[PDB]
Every structure is written in structure tokens, then in C-alpha cells.
Amino acid sequence: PKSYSPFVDREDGYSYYYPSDWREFDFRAHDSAFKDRYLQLQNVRVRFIPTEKNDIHEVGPMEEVVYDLVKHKFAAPNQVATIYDMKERVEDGKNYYTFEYGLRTPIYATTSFATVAVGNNRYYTLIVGANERRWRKVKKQLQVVADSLKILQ
Amino acid sequence: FIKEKYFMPGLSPEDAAARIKQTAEGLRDMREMLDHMSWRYVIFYIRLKQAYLSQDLTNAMNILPESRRNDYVQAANELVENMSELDFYVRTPKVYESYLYYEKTLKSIDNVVEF
Amino acid sequence: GPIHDFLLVFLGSGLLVGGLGVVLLPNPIFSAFSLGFVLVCISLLYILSNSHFVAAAQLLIYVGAINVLIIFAVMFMNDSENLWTIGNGITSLVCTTILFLLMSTILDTSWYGVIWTTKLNQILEQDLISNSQQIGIHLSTDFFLPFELISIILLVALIGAISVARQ
Amino acid sequence: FDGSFIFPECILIFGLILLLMIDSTSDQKDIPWLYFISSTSFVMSITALLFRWREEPMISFSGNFQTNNFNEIFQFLILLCSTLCIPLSVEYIECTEMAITEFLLFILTATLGGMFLCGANDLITIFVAPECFSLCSYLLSGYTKKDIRSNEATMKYLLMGGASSSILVHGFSWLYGSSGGEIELQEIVNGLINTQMYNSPGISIALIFITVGIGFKLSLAPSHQWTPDVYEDSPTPVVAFLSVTSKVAASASATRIFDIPFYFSSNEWHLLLEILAILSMIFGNLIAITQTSMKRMLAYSSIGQIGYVIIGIIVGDSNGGYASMITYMLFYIAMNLGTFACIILFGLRTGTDNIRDYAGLYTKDPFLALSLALCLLSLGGLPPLAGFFGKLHLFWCGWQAGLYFLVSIGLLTSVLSIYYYLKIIKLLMTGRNQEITPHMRNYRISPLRSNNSIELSMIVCVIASTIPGISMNPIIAIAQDTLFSF
Amino acid sequence: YGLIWIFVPIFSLVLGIITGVLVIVWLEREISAGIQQPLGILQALADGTKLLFKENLRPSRGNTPLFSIGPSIAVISILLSYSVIPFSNHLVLADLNIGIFLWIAISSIAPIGLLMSGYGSNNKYSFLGGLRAAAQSISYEIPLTLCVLSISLLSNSLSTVDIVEAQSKYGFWGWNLWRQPIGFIIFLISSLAECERLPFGYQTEYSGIKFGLFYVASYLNLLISSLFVTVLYLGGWNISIQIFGTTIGIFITLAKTYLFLFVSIATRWTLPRLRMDQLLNLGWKFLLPISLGNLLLTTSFQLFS
Amino acid sequence: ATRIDYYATVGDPLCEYSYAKSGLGFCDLDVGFGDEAPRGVLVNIHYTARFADGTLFDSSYKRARPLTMRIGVGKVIRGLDQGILGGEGVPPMRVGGKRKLQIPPKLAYGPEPAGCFSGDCNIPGNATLLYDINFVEIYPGSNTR
Amino acid sequence: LLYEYDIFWAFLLISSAIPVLAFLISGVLSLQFRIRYYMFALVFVVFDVETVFLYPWAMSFDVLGVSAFIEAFIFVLILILGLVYAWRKGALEW
Amino acid sequence: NQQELSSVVLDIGIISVWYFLVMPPIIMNWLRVRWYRRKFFEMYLQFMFVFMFFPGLLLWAPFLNFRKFPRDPNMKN
Amino acid sequence: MILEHVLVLSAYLFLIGLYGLITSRNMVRALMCLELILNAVNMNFVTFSDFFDNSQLKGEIFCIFVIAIAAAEAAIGLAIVSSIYRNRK
């Protein structure tokens, strides 16, 4: 938390950070989603699935849940899903998966460093991405923003 | 071609029994469309199938005995209000209430096909 | 819901009577302003068709730029005059039979059954949702060739309109 | 991203930028060098298209534009029409005191729109490029600006051309709906049977409205009433350029949007083209007998010769290819621009277009009379000229495909074309000192600018109407290798 | 509940723009009482009811539907585009993905109302005046939408709430005053000149309620041009160099539109008519090429961003 | 059900379907020899299209031309894109190849009657189609766009 | 989906019913030939279509690099060459 | 689906009656007592203030009580 | 869901503007009828893009192009009509 804004949501349980004064807007199915006022793809958003599960580890393995999460639930057919390496953390007692992919349409060069979580009969799928034309400068910054999602009760 | 179906005469109660099982099986697999957030095909399918249900329930109730009428109309109007609130939360698009009322209309269509 | 498609039927009735006002009124000025009413209803139909940049583009370009010059040339009244401009027995016949073919084509076609098909190329790729951004990415570089061509077309249209309308 | 396959049109847009830079600097002190940079822009576009000959039929842009050998050939024919027709208005502009600038712009952009219509593959460009060409057509037709009849005729043409393209694009809309949301000709037939709409009334209305719009573009006898009315007052060079370029680009589209997205409904497709072809062959050649004008009956002869081209459209690639249609379009350009060159020279020396003024041209000018008579005999085809062997290759391919009732009607109307052609050749050969007109007797070949390029292109068209019927085997040898039209 | 919560922002916005046009009337009266030297606040509503309670005044011409809807379309061509203003981070009427583009369309349908006014009046005076007013609404649209385009090109967004947020990144210098003052001058002259205010009738048969419609349509045109001065160049709610943020941001944007009202009325009283020849000399041979020029400048400048 | 558009063919060599993870009936008859089919390009196949029982409703040999398809971008059934390219690591086809496919109605057009021109339908609900793809060639100049 | 302009239809309905209602409550309770401005509108219509083309490009220029920059640079080059044509000819003349 | 406030009453109505009651007599009083004692900078900011602060002046527009006594007179009516 | 009625309205425009394009006294009424025909095809493309093609907005992109060409056609047609009006007395 060098210069980061911990926007918590004590009702829904999620809480994570933002680099520098990203704005506020209503996304189509995400709640805050907080775009960065200059770019069009650089934003971090998170949504909900009312499941009846408790752990992301019992619903499936990480390397297999990212496959049907990106290749079947994220990627539009006109773009290809370059799923990069996937990572796992444990915050307090719960697993915390974090992965990387790039949606490559024949136009629209972009990618996303999305992470996934669960709890409270919800299902967190925090997605942050940016353009592919400038991603190596915005790699570790969005990474250290993205791994900072906490699940609190 | 529902505009000609207005001009065409109404369906049979057994035709309604066929179309309600078809409508059940078609509401099974809109999960491909919800998670991709294709809300325009979702509002197309919900408004069309609600237009089918509004003429389908009153036609399909006429083959059921009076023991089945009370609980059938109970589950049917439960399905009607669940589908209308699903219509309201897709014409005000939020993913959570949409999938919640989608599971509600699945667990209300699973026994209308049971009649 | 019912307000949406009742608004659709209301726009349909108003637009068809405005189009018959374009076709069958004694005043060409009355026909041009009925055209303006029709194109306002067209923009409202495109709002109903979930194509909003399209809607305000047709509202911007086609009464704001077209119908102004239309009513300019209509108030500056000029002169009067097998598919050709020979009527009262031909265009009624082909109008009724092409109308009957199109009514038997639209009404007798399960359109929603075709909407059920080809559903994979409208799953609305998740990283963008906004309509004008999507128009701009499909217009600038995807259909780059007609985008570069209408520049030449409107260039030649301006140059020819100068070289004709002055004389 | 690099679309290097559209470099002959990059030379055209480069010439357009140079046209506008010359059209902004001085505006008065450059008549001939502007014509020089435009004609050399044509020649550079041709040599670029020949430098890109052996390239693959690669869809260059983002599923938008296909540089097939078939499309390369039709672009070559449009460039050849523009090259062999561009000197035919270097005297008309200085005779009628119009602007040679923006006229060269109109011809360059009509050539541009035709060359994009040849390679157009999305349904967008099969509306953009034909009506690019058609807005350039309306600007070229409304260009004399001295009378009421020319402007009324081109306004009626603008009405009919907008109706033409709008029916064509309503059919394109029924394509776009019945075939899912698919465009790109290769993907449209996929989109019909992805949606299971091959046996549909919607695709039937699509095919009917598309073929009506193309028949408006091809001026076939249902949709043909525009050409004589609109080729009276519109000037003879743009009558030449627009008729020939419009019908070659419309036959380009009439192969292109009819073989690739319509090989499933090919029965009703062949039947609709057979109806329009037989009526066009009969009625163009049967109106063109009885008219006292020269450009009107030429417009009907152009209708009849496009009705001959539709026999090559109906036959497939296999049982007599589209190569016959290609070489007949080459012959058609070659022997029609010579006819219009002679009609232009009768009007740069007389001023009239009445056919009864032709009595006595053999006595006054045997060179122009020989050129016009030989072009008309090429168009009719009595000796071994170009057009006889073109009609022979057409009727050969139609007879080998079994289209007996196309070939026989084409032969009867070829004889019917022979009649009004030799009706013309009566006048410009004979003369009896009062059948000559006072618009003819004062011919005055000597009050002329110089050794013109009208005469050069005219004698090139005369030789190209004579010897390529004799030398047809290299032309067939270079036309049969267009098998990628699919 | 199904329509009350939806109707009350529309109702509050109509009441807000009625209060704003009351402000513009009495504020031009206040600047005329400053440069020309209580009860006066309600005198503007007295003006509105004097123009309201009157005679219909219909002559014998048979264009009665166009006579009815002429000033009506002239009002609609401003009133339909008040769904566009982000007064704060909230309380905008719609989300409005195409923010200013709908305003350009609704301001471009204004010469339709001007030609319907020129034909609804059976007078050659208002005929020529409707021709002039429609032609200057046409003529001043292109550098208007050019500087609109240049600001939306700086922001890379058309939606107005996004550009209002986007102006507050560098701070006070992040506003479009210091990003495009040239395009700001373009938007100044296009805002003042289009509404028949900075240069200059055509109501010689419209009276009663129709004259009041033209009255409120002109001053609401001034209102919406001023609110776009606020949401384009000056900022929406940001003063960088819960519930209270909305209440202070509406005060910020109303101070900014009062600033532009004072500047616009003062520039009206210190400039005469352009005499209709320098008007077009400006809007075609000067204003449109320099609007294309700073369009090319902002097009070259957004490469590094 | 009806409107089968009777095109009597000779049939194709039957085989057992080595099933996929996504329930695809999958049987590669003839391994092609050449390059794999690229994602997003136009490809030319032949096929005979059959219902559950094997009655024919569509054929590329009916049209006597290889059907041009841009595969992988979802312009066709996902059964096509998962049985020609392969979704769950199923091997992609090579040129001059032949393959039978039992498309499950999950991959196919659901219980929805795909195609209904006038009362009667082209495809009934849950048809569990049988495609017999003859992947013959790549389109000559084709792009991934 | 009828959520973006769901309030805008009611806004249109109120704003469209209010002038006719104002007319009801006000009724119950008490040949030139100049084509210069025509020529201005004739230049306006094609410049307006070119601005319509310039609208979604500048909407969507952020996702694209220098390629869309030179796309619309060629476009506005055509635009300014038409404008210089309008200068040098007898187009505006006012 | 947020409902970030969850306040039923007395959140904005209190601020509305505050801005509509406490503000307009002090605003009109500052318009009265500073009608001449002003720079054009001061008249500029007062014009901006009275533009911002308009619709609260509706209950104070017809009423006018402490307005007219530029002497020390007696009510001799 | 009657939303396929806008196609019926589209065909209604496509017939009435064609009828007005055949029987027309002057030229500008027929030009306006031609514009209604371009509207009919235009709303057909917009409806088909709404129904089927929403990832690519190919029908809506073609809507932008067909309204551009409609503008060019109307501009040059009115240029011809105005030049006739100049050339008559």
C-alpha cells in the first residue's frame, strides 16, 4: 500500500486497491470497475456468482479451473485465449487463485491479469487488464494491484 | 413467426404440453448466454418465452384434474412472478439477480413439466 | 416490455402515415416535413434497436444535413417531369405483388428461431461493453477500405456539387 | 497490417492527390500536363497491375477485398477502357468550354470505384464501390450544362440509379438477415446453412432483388429503360466511358456475387438470368433498328451485347468457362470505344448526333468512314473481326453447356444486329448530293487542333477490333487461367 | 414505485431548467441594469404569463399543423438535449454512452424547426428570416462539432460524465482551458454566434404561446450552450487547485455557467452585428479551417497519450 | 423433421466415435497429410449432413462445391469448430482429410428447431446430428481476419 | 435492452405532450431565388458526413496506435483538400 | 444493486429546507446592502452567486418588509 | 415479442417509396422517396444486426455507410435540381 486506495465493501466482503485516482462508473455487470480516465481497457473490476460452494479448491484444480474459466467463460470466439501462468495464494484460511491471459482478436490488442475467489455463497472473479501495446510497463503495477483482493468476514 | 401465430388459431392443450417441455429444455441451456453476458439475446429469449408462457399456462391447465389445478396454478404463478422479476433484472441489467431468478425459474419450471 | 413493442407499433403507424405523407400529399413541403417526422421516428426505432450511435448518427446526418437542403430545394420550386416511371397500371400491380411476396417472406419466417441459431458471434466480448467504441474499432481498421473510399466519394461529391450547382 | 495488393489503386489515389495539388496551385496555367500526369497515372496503374500478375489470390484487407486473377483481369479491362477512352474527351472539353480539371478527377474516381467493385468481397464494398462509380456517373452525365434535356435526363437517371442500388441493397439486406449476420461472399453461403435458411423464402427474395438490381446495373430488358433517354443529352465521351465501364463492372459483380454466394439456388438463378438475357438480346437489338438517333441505338446495341455476355455468365467455369465472357468483354471494349470515337468525331466536326446526317461521310472523310464501318462490322461480326469470334466463343460455350435456347436466340439477334449496323453503313458509304445534309457537306477536317490522340486511340480500337479476332489464341490462353472465381 | 423514481429526475430537471431560464432572463436584465443603469425576480414569470395568456393569432394560411409544430420543434430541438449534463459525479439524467453526440443531433434538428417556422408564417419577412436563421444554424454547426470532436479526442470518449472526470487528472491545469484555449475560442464564438445573439425577428406571425415558445427556446439554447461550456472546458465538479459532493458540485457548475452567462451577455453588449457577410466569412473561410487546424493539432498530440 | 430435401447419396464408412470431454461423437476416418487447419481462416470442406437415424438433410455434394467456412470464429456450430480444430486438445484436421462426427445437441442447436421457413422445420429439437466431413483443402488466399 | 434510454422515452413523452397541452390551455383560456445560402448548405452536408465519420474514430482512437492516426490523417487530408478547393473556386464567395 | 445510503428520511430534505430557508433572505440582503458598495469583481461574483442561488428566492419574492425608509420619518398615513 | 414488426414496417417503406418513385410529378418528391427506400434498407440492416450480429456491428457499420452514400446521392441530386432551377426562366 504505497499510494493505494483500499476501497472496501463490508457488505459484499471484497476489498482491493487502486494505483492513482481512478474514477467511478457503473459497469454493465461489475459494480465499481473504476477505469483510469485516459485508457479505455485499463480498469479493474469484480463481480459475483451466487453459488453454494465454499472453496475454489473443491470446485476444481486451479490449472483446470482457469482452462474452463478463460477458454469457455471469458474468451469470445473471435479472440484467442493466450492463458499465461496461474498462481495461488492463501490469505487467512482460504485459497486465492490468480492467473493471466490475453484475448487476441484480429483487432483490439488487449490482455487481462484476472484473479478469482469465492466465499459467503458468492464467487469473486476480479478482472484487471490493459492494452497489449503497453503491457510490460503496466505488468507488475497491475499485478500488485490484482493480488490485493481480500475476503473478509 | 409469432405475428402470424396471432393470426393463426390457438394451440392445443397437448400442443401446449409439448411446448412447455420444449420451453423447459430451452431454459435449461441459456447458461451459455448468461456468463458471456449476451443480455440482448437474453431479453429476446425471456420476452419471447414469457409471451409463450402467457398463452401456454392457461391452455395447459385444461388437461389436469382439480387436485392438480391448485398446486399447478400456484407453481405457475410463482413461475410468472419469477420470470417477470427476471425480466425486470435483465431490463435493469445486473448479473447476480439475473442468475438468481434464472435458478428460480429453473426450480419453478422443473415441476410445471411434472404438472 | 409491452411498453417497448407498443412503442414499436406506435412508431410503425406514425412512420407509415408519414411515409404516405411523403408519397401522397399535394404539397411537397408537407411531404418534406412528413419525411422529417419519419426520420425522427427512424432514429427512435434505432434507439429501440439498441443501436444508439447509429440512432443519433441518422438523426444528425439525415435531417440535420439532408432535410435542410431538401426543404431548401422544395421551397425553391423548380419544375415537373418493366420498372420505369410509368404508372396507374404497372406500379400498382408490381407494388401489390412485391408487397405480397415481402409480407409472405417476413411474416412466414421464424425469425426468432434463426436468432436461436448463429448465437456464438453475438456473445459480446467481455473486455468492452460500449457501443461507440465497438463501432470505432470495427469501422476504423476492420472495414478500413470503405472507410477510406467514402472519403474519396464525398470528396468527389463536394467537388461535383460545386462544379454543377454553380452552373 | 500492409495491403500491398491494392497498389494499382494506390497509384490512382496518388494521382488524385496530385490532381488536387495542381487544382489548388494555379488553376489556369495547366491544361496539358494535367492530362499527362493523369494518363501516366493510368499507365503506371496498368504496369503495377501487370507487375502483380502472378500473385496469389489473397484476400488482402481484413476479410474485405480479394485480388483474384479474375478480379485482376476485370480491373485490367477497366483500366484499358479508361486508357482507350481518356483521349476521347480532350477535344470535347475545349469545344464545350468545360473544366478539364475535375473531369479527369471524375474519370479517375469512376475507374477507382470500378476497380474496387471488381475486387469487392464484403457486401459493404459491393454497395460503396458501385455507387462510388454511380455518383461519379451522375456527375459525368450532368456535365454539358447548356440545356434542359440533359439535366432532366440525368436527374431521371439519378432517380433510377438510386432505385437500382436500393433494390440491390435491399436484396443484400435479405442476404444479411437470412444468412445470420454474415457478409464476405465466401462466408455468406456458410451463413445461409448455419441458420438453415437455404430452403427459405427470404433467400429467394434476396436472389430476386439482387438480380433485379444487377439487371438495372446491366440494363437488361426488364430494367433497361434508362440508357436511350440518358444517352441523348449526356455527352458522348461519358456515354462511352460510363456505358462500357458500368457494364464491365456490373458483369464483374454479376459473376462475383452470383457464383460464390449463390451456388445453392443456381437453378432459379440461371432461370432469372436466362429470362433477362433472352429478353435483353431480343429487345435491345429489336429497338435499335427503328431509331433515328445514333447514341440511343448504340445504347440498345450495348444492351444486346451485354445480353450476349449473360450467356457467358450463365455457363459455369467448367463446361466452357467465364474466359469467353472475359475475352468478349475485351472485344466489347475494343470495338465499342472505336464506335464511340467515331461518334465523338462526328460532333467535334459537325455538332450533331442525328443518324441521317451520316449520308456522305465516305466522300468527305474515307478514314473516319472506314473506321466507323469497320467498328460496326466488328460489332455485327460478318468477316473474321474481333466481335464475330467473341460471339463465336460465347455461343460455343453456351452450346457446350447445353444452353441451346440461349445460343439460338443470340444468333437470331446477332442477325438482327447485322441489320441496323448495315443500316448505318448505308449512310456513311453512299451519298447522292441531296441525301447529304447541310450538317454534313461542311465537314472541315482541316480546322482541327493537331495530330490528335482521338485518332490514335481510334485506330488502336480499329486494329483491336480487327486483329484480336485473328489473334485470339493468346487472349484465350491468358483468359482460361482464371479458375479461382469459384 | 415503478414510475415515480424514474419520473422525479425528469421532473426535477424540468424545474431546474425553468429556474435556469428564469436566471438567464433576469440576469440579462441585471447586466442591462448595470450597463444601462424582489419584484423583478417575479417580473420574468410575469413576462412568461404575459406571453402565455394571449391570443392565438392565426391568419388565413392553410398550414395549421406546421403552424402548430413549428415553435414546438424549435423548443424540442433544445429541450430533448437536457438529458446530457453531468452536474456532478451523480444526478445526470441518463448514463448516455454517446454523450455530446446526441446534443449535436438535437442541435442539428433546430434548422428543421427554423424552416418549419419560415413556412408556418405567411410572411416574406419571416420567410427570409427563417432562411437566414436556418442557414446560420447550418453554417455554425461545423466548427462547433469540430471543437466538440477535438475535446472528445483529448478525452477519447463521447460520454459526458467520462470527459468531466477526465479533465481532473493534472489538476487545475488539467482543464481544457489549458489544453485547448484555441478550441475554447472556437466553442465561444460558436456558442455565442449560433443562437442569433452575437450577430443578428422572423416571428412576425407567431404570437401568443408560439412567441413564448421561441422565447424560451432561444434562452434555453443559451442555457444548454453555457452548460456545455461548463462540462467541456471549465470542469463539471472539480476544484482540485457521500452526499455533500453532489451539492457542492452543482454549485460549482452553476458558478461556471453564471460565469459564462456574464461573459456571453457582456460580449453581446460590447459587440455589434457582423452584418451577415463577415458572419459567413468567419464560419466558412476562417472558423472551419482553423477548427480543422486545431483538430489536426490535437490529432498529432494524442499520439504520445 | 420434414423438408429433408431428398439427395440420395451412397453413404460413408461407419466407425466408432472416440468421444470427447464435451460429449462430441468423434471419429477421424482418414488422416490428412499436410498442414493443420488454421484458426480463423476460410477452409473448404465437403460433408454429408445427417440426423440421429442417419437421414440426410444437407450436403456439400448436393451443391457440387466445397463449402467455404471460416472456422474457429464461431460462424458455424461449435460442433464444427470442436471437431475440425479441436477444443479440448482434440487433434486438428489436415488437408485432404475425412472424418465422421456425431454432434451432440449440446454442441448442436439445442432443443431449438434450427430453421423453420413455413410451419414445418428444417431441424427438429435435439436432433443429435451426424456430420461426415471431407476436409479437402484450405481456401487459396485466406486470412485469419 | 431499454436501460440506457429508459428514462429518455419518458423525457420525450413529457416534452412532446407539453407543447400541445400548452396550445390547448392557450386556446381554451383566451418569392426570392437566392441560392448562396443553398450553396453553403450544399458544402455543409458533405462536410457534416465527414464529421460523422470523424466521430467514432476519435471515440476509438485510444485502443489503436499510429495506424488509425494515419487512417484519419489521410481522411482529414481529403477533407482539407476539399476545403482548399472550396477556397480557390467560386464556392463560398461571401 | 448497491443501496449505499439506506437512509429513509431526513438526509436530503433537511439540507433542502436548510438551503431553501436559511440561504435566500441572507442572499437577498447581501443583494440589497451591497448594491452600490462593490467592485465589478464584486458585482461579478455577486452575479455568479445570484445565478447559482435562484430557486430558493420563491418564498421571498412577493414579500418585502424592511425596504424603504431613507430618512427618520413618521407614519403620517 | 412483436419485434419482427419493424421488418414489416421496413417492407412498407420499401414499397411506398418505390410507388412514389414511379409516379412522381417533379424530381425532388422522387428523390425523397428514394431516401425513404434507403431508410427501408437501412433499418433492415439495423434490425438484422440487432438480431444476429452484435459482437461485430456489421449491419450497423453498413448503416453508417449507406447513410453516407444516401447523403452523397441526395446532395448531388439536389445539385442537379438546383442547376435546373438556375437554367430555367
For E109-121, give the DSSP string.
SHHHHHHHHHHHS
Separation CA D188–CA D169 (nearest Å) = 15
Residue F114 near residue F123 (C-beta atoms within 8 A): yes
Separation CA F45–CA I30 (nearest Å) = 48
CB contact under 8 A, C108 and F78: no
Cell 440420395 belongs to which residue? Answer: F8
Separation CA D331–CA D393 (nearest Å) = 11
Contacts of C146 in chain I (CB under 8 A): 65
DSSP secondary structure string for all residues of A56-115: TTTS--HHHHHHHHHTTTT--TTSEE-----EEEESSSSEEEE--B-EE-SS-BEEE--E
Separation CA I71–CA C66 (nearest Å) = 6
What cell was used for D334?
A: 475494343
Residue D123 near residue I45 (C-beta atoms within 8 A): no
Separation CA D362–CA D372 (nearest Å) = 10
Contacts of A76 in chain I (CB under 8 A): 55
What number of other Cβ atoms are within 10 A of residue G13's Cβ? 12
Kindly report the nearest CA distance between residue C133 and chain I, in angstroms. 11
> What sign does the CA torsion over G45, G46, G50, G53 have?
positive
DSSP secondary structure string for all residues of B26-74: HHHT-HHHHTTT-HHHHHHHHHHHHHHHHHHHHHHGGGS-HHHHHHHHH
What cell was used for D427?
A: 449512310
Residue D254 near residue D307 (C-beta atoms within 8 A): no
Contacts of B41 in chain I (CB under 8 A): 54
Kindly report the nearest CA distance between residue G60 and chain I, in angstroms. 14
Q: Helix, strand, or coil here: F28?
A: strand
Kindly report the nearest CA distance between residue D254 and chain C, in angstroms. 19
Q: Between residues 17 and 56 of chain I, which touch chain C (CB distance below 8 Å)?
A: 17-33, 35-36, 39, 42-43, 46-47, 49-56
Separation CA A89–CA A150 (nearest Å) = 11
Number of domains in chain D: 1
Kindly report the nearest CA distance between residue G64 and chain E, in angstroms. 10
Q: How far is CA F10 from CA E189, F13, F45, F49, in A?
A: 79, 10, 18, 13
Q: Helix, strand, or coil here: G73?
A: helix
Of the candidates C46, I69, I24, the residue with the CA atom closest to the CA atom of residue D164 = I69
Nearest to I79 among G42, G48, G49 (CB): G42
What cell was used for E221?
A: 439554447
DSSP secondary structure string for all residues of C113-140: HHHHSS-GGGS--TT---HHHHHHHIII
What number of other Cβ atoms are within 10 A of residue E57's Cβ? 12
Beta strands A122-124 and A103-104, pairing class:
unpaired
Separation CA C56–CA E164 (nearest Å) = 21
List residues of chain B with CB under 8 Å from any CB of chain H: 94, 96-97
Separation CA D174–CA I48 (nearest Å) = 9
What cell was used for H57?
A: 428566492
Separation CA D326–CA D390 (nearest Å) = 9
What cell was used for F131?
A: 456430420
Cβ neighbours of residue E212 under 8 Å, at least 6 residues apart? E48, E51, E52
Give residue limits of the domains in chain I.
4-87
Which run of H or of E encompasses F132? strand F130-138
Q: Which residues pair with A124 in a beta bridge?
A: A117
Of the candidates E166, E221, E235, the residue with the CA atom closest to the CA atom of residue E190 = E221
Cell 460489332 belongs to which residue? Answer: D379
**What CATH number was assigned to the domain covering residues I4-87?**
1.10.287.3510
Residue D413 near residue D333 (C-beta atoms within 8 A): no
Q: Does F144 touch chain D (CB under 8 A)?
A: no
The answer to whether C and I touch (≥3 CB pairs < 8 Å) is yes
Residue E76 near residue E236 (C-beta atoms within 8 A): no
Q: How far is CA I39 from CA C70, C139, D86, E104, F130, in A?
A: 16, 20, 37, 21, 43
Q: In this structure, what are the phi and psi dihedrals at residue B96, rounded to the nearest 5 degrees?
A: -70, -55
* Region class of I56: left (phi > 0), else alpha (psi between -120 and 50), else beta: beta
Q: Between residues 57 and 116 of chain C, which touch chain E (CB distance below 8 Å)?
A: 57, 59-60, 63-65, 67-68, 71-72, 75
What cell was used for D414?
A: 446477332
Contacts of D27 in chain G (CB under 8 A): 88
Q: Which residues pair with F43 in a beta bridge?
A: F69, F138
Beta strands F42-50 and F67-70, pairing class:
antiparallel
Residue A124 near residue A14 (C-beta atoms within 8 A): yes
| Neighboring chains of I (3 or more beta-carbon pairs < 8 A) | A, B, C, D, G
Separation CA D272–CA D278 (nearest Å) = 10
Cβ neighbours of residue D197 under 8 Å, at least 6 residues apart? C114, D178, D179, D203, F115, F117
Separation CA D279–CA D274 (nearest Å) = 8
What number of other Cβ atoms are within 10 A of residue A55's Cβ? 11
Largest CA distance in chain I: 56
Angle at C46 between CA C41 and CA C48, to 5 degrees: 95
Separation CA E131–CA E115 (nearest Å) = 7
Contacts of G61 in chain E (CB under 8 A): 153, 156, 302
Nearest to A50 among B36, B93, B99 (CB): B99
CB contact under 8 A, F110 and B22: no
Residue F76 near residue D190 (C-beta atoms within 8 A): yes
Q: Which domain holds residue C97?
A: 2-166
Burial D197-227 (b: 16+ CB within 10 A, else e): bbbbbbbbbbbbbbbbbbbbbbbbbbbbbbb
Q: How far apart are the first and last CA of chain C?
A: 55
- Cα F103 to its chain centre, rounded Å, is 8
Burial of E29 (0-12, 13-18, 19+ CB in 10 A): middle
> What sign does the CA torsion over D360, D364, D366, D369 have?
negative
Residue D306 near residue D379 (C-beta atoms within 8 A): no
Separation CA I7–CA I26 (nearest Å) = 30
Residue D398 near residue D267 (C-beta atoms within 8 A): no
* Region class of D235: left (phi > 0), else alpha (psi between -120 and 50), else beta: beta
Of the candidates E255, E237, E268, the residue with the CA atom closest to the CA atom of residue E166 = E237
Q: In this structure, what are the phi and psi dihedrals at residue D232, rounded to the nearest 5 degrees?
A: -85, -65
Residue D435 near residue D357 (C-beta atoms within 8 A): no
Cell 439477334 belongs to which residue? Answer: D413
Contacts of B26 in chain F (CB under 8 A): 110-112
Separation CA E15–CA G15 (nearest Å) = 13
Number of domains in chain C: 1
| Chain breaks of chain B after residues with C–N above 2.5 Å | none
The CATH number, out of the four listed (3.20.20.60, 1.20.58.1610, 3.30.70.1380, 3.40.140.10), of the domain defined by the range G5-88: 1.20.58.1610
> What sign does the CA torsion over E194, E195, E199, E205 have?
positive
Q: What is the stated resolution of the deposited model, in angstroms?
A: 3.9
Q: Does A76 touch chain I (CB under 8 A)?
A: yes
Secondary structure of chain D as H, E, C letters: CCCHHHHHHHHHHHHHHHHHHHHHHCCCCCCHHHHHHHHHHHHHHHHHHHHCCCCCCEECCCCCEECCHHHHHHHHHHHHHHHHHHHHHCCHHHHHCCCCCCHHHHHHHHHHHHHHHHHECCCCHHHHHHHHHHHHHHHHHCCCCCCCHHHHHHHHHHHHHHHHHHHHHHHHHHHHHHCCCCCCHHHHHHHHHHCCCCCCHHHHHHHHHHHHHHHHHHCCHHHCCCHHHHCCCCCHHHHHHHHHHHHHHHHHHHHHHHHCCCCCCHHHHHHHHHHHHHHHHHHHHHHCCCCCECHHHHHHHHHHHHHHHHHHHHCCCCCCCCHHHHHHHHHHHHHHHHHHHHHHHCCCCCCCCEHHHHCCHHHHCHHHHHHHHHHHHHHHCCCCCHHHHHHHHHHHHHHHCCCHHHHHHHHHHHHHHHHHHHHHHHHCCCCCCCCCCCCCCCCCCCCCCCCCHHHHHHHHHHHHHHHHHHCCHHHHHHHCCCHHHC
Nearest chain H alpha carbon to E246: H12
Residue D234 near residue D150 (C-beta atoms within 8 A): yes
Contacts of G89 in chain C (CB under 8 A): 162
CB contact under 8 A, E156 and A38: yes
Q: How far apart are the first and last CA of chain B?
A: 27
Separation CA D284–CA D412 (nearest Å) = 13
Contacts of A77 in chain F (CB under 8 A): 72-74, 81
Burial of E281 (0-12, 13-18, 19+ CB in 10 A): middle
The CATH number covering residue C72 comes to 1.20.120.1200
Residue A149 near residue A14 (C-beta atoms within 8 A): yes
Residue F17 near residue F102 (C-beta atoms within 8 A): yes
Within 13 Å and on the Cβ side, how many CA atoms surround H1? 20
Contacts of C21 in chain I (CB under 8 A): none
Cell 472456422 belongs to which residue? Answer: F71
Which run of H or of E encompasses B15? helix B13-28
DSSP secondary structure string for all residues of I29-89: HHHHHHHHHHHHHHHHHHHHHHHT--SS-HHHHHHHHHHHHHHHHHHHHHHHHHHHHHT--
Q: Which domain holds residue D136?
A: 1-486
Separation CA H67–CA H76 (nearest Å) = 18
Q: Does I56 touch chain A (CB under 8 A)?
A: yes
Of the candidates B19, G41, D350, E183, the residue with the CA atom closest to the CA atom of residue I74 = G41
Residue A121 near residue A11 (C-beta atoms within 8 A): no
Separation CA D267–CA D256 (nearest Å) = 17
Q: How far is CA C59 from CA C62, E37, G49, in A?
A: 6, 45, 12
Separation CA D286–CA D290 (nearest Å) = 8
State the count of interchain CB pairs (< 8 A) between D and F: 69
CB contact under 8 A, F116 and B26: no
